Amino acid sequence: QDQLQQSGAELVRPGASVKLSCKALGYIFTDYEIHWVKQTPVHGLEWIGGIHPGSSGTAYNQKFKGKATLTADKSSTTAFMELSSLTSEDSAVYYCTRKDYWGQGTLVTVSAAKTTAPSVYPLVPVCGGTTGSSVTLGCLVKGYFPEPVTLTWNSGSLSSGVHTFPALLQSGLYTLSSSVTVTSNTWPSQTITCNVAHPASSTKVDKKIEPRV
Amino acid sequence: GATPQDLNTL
Amino acid sequence: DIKMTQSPSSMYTSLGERVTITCKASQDINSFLTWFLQKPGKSPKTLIYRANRLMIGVPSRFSGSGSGQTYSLTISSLEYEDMGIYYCLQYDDFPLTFGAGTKLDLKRADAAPTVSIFPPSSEQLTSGGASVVCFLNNFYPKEINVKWKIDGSERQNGVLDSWTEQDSKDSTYSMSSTLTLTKDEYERHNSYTCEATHKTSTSPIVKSFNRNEC
Fold this sequence. Notes:
The complex is a heterotrimer of chains A (213), B (10) and C (214). Chain A is built from one helix and 17 strands. With 213 residues, chain A is mostly beta strands. Chain A has two domains: 112 residues, Immunoglobulin-like (Sandwich); 99 residues, Immunoglobulin-like (Sandwich). In chain A, a hairpin with an 8-residue loop joins strand 9 and strand 10. Chain C has two domains: 108 residues, Immunoglobulin-like, CATH 2.60.40.10; 103 residues, Immunoglobulin-like (Sandwich). The longest helix of chain C is centred in the last third of the chain and has 5 residues. Chain C is built from two helices and 19 strands. The PDB classes it as polyspecificity. The entry lists the keywords cross reactivity, FAB-fragment, HIV-1.
């Protein structure tokens, strides 16, 4: 009845191992199978296998047999999933499910990347300086690790007409970008600043968008 | 709320 | 491996409309089927189990049906909170298999993207890199093709594309396109061009600049 509680986000190196945990609460742990499922943008949702904590009986997808090890601990009402020899293809969200209930999922990121502060670039309109009603400014945040990054415009004051595009991987590091549209009067007489912060590397960068000479 | 009629075969 | 064929695969619907999603199994699965919904950046929520049992707490909109090989999920009157991806799951036999998903979008009048091109920044250029950015923003529907052109010819690598999700008030989508080269190759060419194709037009929507300053 109640639920599944998964272990935290894991960040491992290629060729290592992870052990993920899934705590069952609010129900008789030994009467239900616990199944592990993997989700990636590429392949979608795939079943790894499952254990029956009562009988100890297990079943595996032939694709994970040899890679994934499933175990259960009755005293702590916790199911475990071990993954060995990791590569970047194992980077995904892992979920434990009772079939009706789902845990919240653990993110496993396989990478060699070292923590690296982002570079922030102010994107100014193209020379000419259009005679439209509005102007679109932009801000590009390149090469950081790990995700996350928070980006704001004018310290959060500017919220209308903003788009912050999900980060993507480029040669092992993350790249993010964002745009704001403001009306013609506004910029450049008022100043528009892009604020980037990356908790992981203790960085906090502010970048004003100056017109191009 | 559902019973091991979540088709427990293990 | 039992195969599940979910359809349709994406639907353009209205608030208050009645929706019907289907799952066919490659053999008979004895009503051992679940229906679950997943919202962006969120864990799955099961709605129905054993083909037609509502799950505690799920609105009574939702309703499952079928037997044998063809299953259905009906949402009698769509509400904003219902937007996301829907999946069916067969648990008749191992391995467990899932349908491919059904994505729901609020339909709207067709809008062409409003395009902007941004030459590299001086600061990027002073570090060896050159990124050319193109924003195609506020359009509908989500289908869009982007081609990059350096001095008249297509460049297929170094491009990075990112999509926003449908936006809550005005129902349009947006995308970012970044072309990354080195300073040297950037400094070797003059005219950079962003080409966008979308239902709202015949001739593509083109944006450009010249490094000697257009």
